[PDB]
Amino acid sequence: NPTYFFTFGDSYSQTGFSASGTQPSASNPMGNPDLGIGTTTNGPNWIGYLTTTENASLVLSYNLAAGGATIDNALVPAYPGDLASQFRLFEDVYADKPASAPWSAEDAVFGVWIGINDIGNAYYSTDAETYTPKLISRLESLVEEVYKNGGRKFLFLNVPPTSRSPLFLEQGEEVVKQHAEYLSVYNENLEGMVDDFTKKKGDVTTVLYDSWSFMTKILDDPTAYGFPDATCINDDGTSCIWWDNWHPGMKYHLLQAEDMKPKLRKLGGW
């Protein structure tokens, strides 16, 4: 009795999973590529760890996240594989519950981690209080497509403090602050959406995971987590928080997956 874990997002979630590659099975829960390949962490990322390390039962991962993704290129544009296109791929391949993924409302979990690039590209050019509601509304309409397919269990991750990545720190503290303030508005509106959606539908199980507070705790006190400081970079993925100048490494992703596990118990795989 597997949990079908369909995920959507950007490079913080990518693994390089192809819908024409090897598909998930009990002997091979990620499908493709091998666990630990295709990420921005030097090893497994949070999805690989949730699926194969923190799982309480069989979890099958169908990971549609794509590097560089924004929510919808008609709002903040970036790369062809935006969140809207990931939902289209889901609708094309898995929404109708094929024999390769015969999911039901009781055993499918839809996880979404998006917003890093929308904020990263629009924090200085748009008004957060009137623009982030447009982004969040588009996210909600995409979620409604899976709801119409019969999905009822949802996991949303809020946006972590990319303002404190080495990449953004270089732009000066006033830019870090401009970005962080915009991001806080986005995350507030994300929380409001998830609450409103949960209440209006009445038959959904949702988790809003506060990645922002978790990563902030580590950045504020890195040595408590075994990191030497909050800014060094090491592509081994474990010696520093950062694998490159704006992606965290596998050790960070493991710590986050471990923090997430108890909060995901109500979703069925953890």
Automatic annotation (TrEMBL):
Annotated TM spans: none
Keywords noted in UniProt: Hydrolase, Signal
Keyword Nucleus: no
GO MF, any single term: hydrolase activity, acting on ester bonds
SUPFAM superfamilies assigned to the protein according to its UniProt record, in alphabetical order: SGNH hydrolase
Pfam families reported for this sequence: Lipase_GDSL
Coiled coil stretches, renumbered: none
CDD domains assigned to the protein according to its UniProt record, in alphabetical order: fatty_acyltransferase_like
PANTHER family, sorted: GDSL LIPASE/ACYLHYDROLASE FAMILY PROTEIN (AFU_ORTHOLOGUE AFUA_4G14700) (PTHR45648), GDSL LIPASE_ACYLHYDROLASE FAMILY PROTEIN (AFU_ORTHOLOGUE AFUA_4G14700) (PTHR45648:SF22)
Protein name: Cellulose-binding GDSL lipase/acylhydrolase
Source species of the chain: Aspergillus niger
Lineage per the UniProt record: Eukaryota, Fungi, Dikarya, Ascomycota, Pezizomycotina
